[PDB]
Design a protein around this nucleic acid. Sequence first.
RNA 1: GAAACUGCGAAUGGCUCAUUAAAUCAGUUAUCGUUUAUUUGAUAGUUCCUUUACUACAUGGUAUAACUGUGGUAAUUCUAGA
RNA 2: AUUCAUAAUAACUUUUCGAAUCGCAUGGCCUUGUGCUGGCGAUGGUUCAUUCAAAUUUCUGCCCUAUCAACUUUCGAUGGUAGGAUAGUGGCCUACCAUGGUUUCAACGGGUAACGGGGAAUAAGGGUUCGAUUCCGGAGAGGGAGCCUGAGAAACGGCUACC
Lengths: 223, 260, 134
Amino acid sequence: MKLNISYPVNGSQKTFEIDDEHRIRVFFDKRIGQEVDGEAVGDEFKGYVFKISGGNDKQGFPMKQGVLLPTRIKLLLTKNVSCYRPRRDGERKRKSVRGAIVGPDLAVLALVIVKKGEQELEGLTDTTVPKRLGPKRANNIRKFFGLSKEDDVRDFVIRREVTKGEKTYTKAPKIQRLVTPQRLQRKRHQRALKVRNAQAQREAAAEYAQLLAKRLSERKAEK
Amino acid sequence: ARGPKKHLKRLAAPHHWLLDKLSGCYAPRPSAGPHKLRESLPLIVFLRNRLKYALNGREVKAILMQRHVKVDGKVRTDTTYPAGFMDVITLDATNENFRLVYDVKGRFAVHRITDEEASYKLGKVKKVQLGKKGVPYVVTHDGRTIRYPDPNIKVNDTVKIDLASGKITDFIKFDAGKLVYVTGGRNLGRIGTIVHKERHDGGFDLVHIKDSLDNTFVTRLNNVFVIGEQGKPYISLPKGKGIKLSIAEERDRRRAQQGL
Amino acid sequence: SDAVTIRTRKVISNPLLARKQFVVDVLHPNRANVSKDELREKLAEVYKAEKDAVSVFGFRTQFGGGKSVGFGLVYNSVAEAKKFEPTYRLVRYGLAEKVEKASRQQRKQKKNRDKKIFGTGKRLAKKVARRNAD
RNA sequence: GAAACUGCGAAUGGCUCAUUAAAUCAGUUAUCGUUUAUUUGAUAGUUCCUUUACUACAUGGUAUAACUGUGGUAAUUCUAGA
RNA sequence: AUUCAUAAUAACUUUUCGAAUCGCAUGGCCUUGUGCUGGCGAUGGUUCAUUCAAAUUUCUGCCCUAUCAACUUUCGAUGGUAGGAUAGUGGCCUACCAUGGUUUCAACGGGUAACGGGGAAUAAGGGUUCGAUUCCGGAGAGGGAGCCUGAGAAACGGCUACC
């Protein structure tokens, strides 16, 4: 029926639905990521290769990968597959899920779109995402451009400014792994320790063999 | 079963803490300790009940955040941190220094020691060993091992500590006339200084122990501990002087304390 | 009326909390059952720290009528006292603030009304907005 | 300063005596037959030797939560693709 | 007392580990250079010895019952041999071999309104009868199984399946 249809390039989606019989049912008998034609789906598209991306049914079940039997089955769902929001630390579960090849079971089906092609940016492509969480670690800040990494960033920080403190904060992701002391202080405090203690055990060792040999001077000469 | 026991009630720690019966509650459980059993005591039992500095359990935990507690120069802001034997609980400002000794009435002590002489503990050894890659070491009351000791002293003596680390100084053996000192048991810690040892090769060890009462008794080896050369002792003994003065003239002495 | 006679015993000054700990003996003939805090305001003058660094609880009225056992705690600091005074004694004295959160049966059910939320919950709140009424 | 990641607790505490007659248990050793996050104290001058342009040692990487968008089922501390 | 801690020799690992983590402070240095030194911690990490504990294990003690007179093995009963697992010991399990274990001091079997002890009640002494319950230890979380996470569980205010 309805179709949540997403899009990987800059970022937009919405949900579509067609009522006609096999116009909405050209989809089935192939499972995930194969192909969707353009004329059978709503008339905006024309022969555009689509990574069809799993379905949802009535009773709210998802469809994950460990299927190829076209019914609702039951299995053991540990860590990576659809479950776990939330449970605790063993934690397996026993869970049923609707799986494979789609048809007269679908309620909404998830789509993603490789080829817009010619027509229909206006519901699927036409705007980008105002992408929220920019790069924080110092190298991938520069990997936003490839800034020829000796830049000394605090140059092109990802600034977001909104004036609710009436100062707009002029601030950045609070960047991570800057090439500066006192991080450089910490690595030189490493060799400040590892020379001190390793020598001090040796000058404790050079004391002990001296004290033992003077003891051995009477021990081996016990007459 | 199934895991450790992070509680214990009262009536389960022995008499030597002198807690109340009708508190109707759980005892102070000691934390995991460096030194010994629950026949030791945590510091909060020493403060709020013997020395009487506080009432609330919120109160005694709030002293330790001000950083006045100290053993050995170590910080130890743990509330129910256990306290070993002769391990001097020195202080910051208020300047007192308390050595952990045994008085003549079962439980431990409330005894001050001076500012100097409080910068050394006294250490029973339990295990001398050569180990990994030729590194000799001793162990202590807390098991605080010390690299490169005085070689070939033995197990079972006492050790003077320099408190920068171990840095041991003087060996004190056991001979026919020295100082020994009981630690634990029904007749714990007065003095008997020695009279004559035995061994009992193989099973257990006993020692004949002669008081200033001038009779004898015998306590087994794990309570036996040497102080030093006779008549020296390294610690000023508390004001019971280690007799087990007898009950027939315990009563005659205490109304001669009040004068009537 | 007949010399209430604040007398003090076991006067132990604690150096590591800047305070004194002591037991007050009170023999008050011909007039009983005075107060929490009048005796403090007579005790806080003879110890010369201030008027309100003292923390009392007591006046255990002994049998007969005319004798009681008090227990006050003067500190050697004014503002640092409130950092270590028991807060129920401060709201008895009125210098601090009394807290007022909810009672027991509203708070622990609120913990039960805390785990059902997914994250910060407004993802559900957008979705329970759109659907209902769909 | 939320959530959420990570670490940690959840294995204590409380409650009952149905099973349980050398079984548990009281004392009493033994562990030369073992493990132990936590508590303590000591603690790692060699790190790859593809040879010296593998290259960041003045600091490389993914693969992601919470969040944002539209979802499904009447449902549960249920859950999707982007 | 050891084939103990240990050292040494030749290999050894889908090479285990041996700081690419945060805090307050700002100094000295003389060659003011992203030069060289350096405080007090906090976490976390291998190894040894502790500690907190777990797990086995010797030594004695048990209520009534002979209208309970011989129980035990070819599905280990007892022991040896060699292994498989095990945190490690062990017929714990497996193949081969030997026929052995307890007993008229009561084993075995049945009963038990039997949790086991520290105690409680009555009281000349000598004792009889309770003790589910305040403390210690055990078992269990409707009935028997099985398992993950975690140092610690065969957990049950954890899970899986059957009744």
